[PDB]
Amino acid sequence: QEAPEDLLERLLGEMELELIELRRALAQTIATFKSTERQRDAQQLIAQRWYEKAQAALDRGNEQLAREALGQRQSYQSHTEALGKSLGEQRALVEQVRGQLQKLERKYLELKSQKNLYLARLKSAIAAQKIEEIAGNLDNASASSLFERIETK
Amino acid sequence: ERKYLELKSQKNLYLARLKSAIAAQKIEEIAGNLDNASASSLFERIETKILELEAERELLNPPPSPLDKKFEQWEEQQAVEATLAAMKARRS
């Protein structure tokens, strides 16, 4: 009740002290995902690199070396399969959080869009009030009637 | 190292979702605080506080009664009918 309008402007103003944090915090979520993606790219490239070790090593009609060449890849595939599926689930978190900020800004801007509208009608309400204050004060209302009481005097 | 790096790889991921969790929380803190939730309603309670005064003037200022509305409505019709009468007479 004590100057809410000052709080109103400041309370939404403090929304920038926090909405930016999601902007920064959300960004902290993606580079690791893409860094892991690059590491996945390196891992799959490492697996692809081992594909060459497991591609032409069989040449000359040998298999002993190629027998284990893929064996190391399987251990890397376990990382790829295990880490690869981690990337897939990570997509949900980045997607959902982005909508929050989109909704937040869309809602907060709408909140702040109607914030001034609430203030807009507030000042209109103040304007719709201050007009009668002097008009009422001057008017005698026939109680004191000091515009006619003095005349009758 | 494979496990510790993975541990430390997900260590920041736990922190990554932690900051996302912080981000997913700090957003509502100001939003909730500003919102009245109709308890204090100091965005409308104050409006309803002013809404008392507009009735005060209406208590002093005579609001246009249905009789008064008919008076002006009938008078407006009278003015509409009277004014157009002065024209057709003017045309003739």
Which string of DSSP letters, residue by residue, matches chain B?
Answer: -HHHHHHHHHHHHHHHHHHHHHHHHHHHHHHHHH--TTTS-TTTHHHHHHHHHHHHHHHHS----HHHHHHHHHHHHHHHHHHHHHHHHHH-
B33 to chain A, any CB pair closer than 8 A? The answer is: yes
Cα distance between residue A147 and residue B9, in whole Å: 86
Q: What is the resolution of this structure in A?
A: 6.6
Residue count of chain B: 92
Q: What is the DSSP letter of A1?
A: -
* A14 vs B contacts (CB less than 8 Å): 30
Phi (first) and psi of residue A11, to 5 degrees: -60, -45
What are the structure tokens assigned to A22, written together? 């999601």
**Residue written as tokens 């004060």?**
A137
- Of A139, A117, A98, A132, the C-alpha closest to B58 is A132
**Residue written as tokens 């009918």?**
B81
Judge contact between A43 and A76, C-beta under 8 A. Answer: yes
3-class DSSP assignment, residue B56: helix
Cα distance between residue B4 and residue B7, in whole Å: 5
Minimum-distance CB partner of B13 among A21, A32, A136: A32
CB count within 10 Å of CB A94 equals: 14
For an interface test with B, give the residue of A5, A28, A103 to mutate (most B CBs within 10 A): A28
Cα distance between residue A19 and residue B30, in whole Å: 10
Cα distance between residue B62 and residue B71, in whole Å: 14
Judge contact between A66 and A19, C-beta under 8 A. Answer: no
Judge contact between A107 and A35, C-beta under 8 A. Answer: no
The structure's method of determination equals cryo-EM
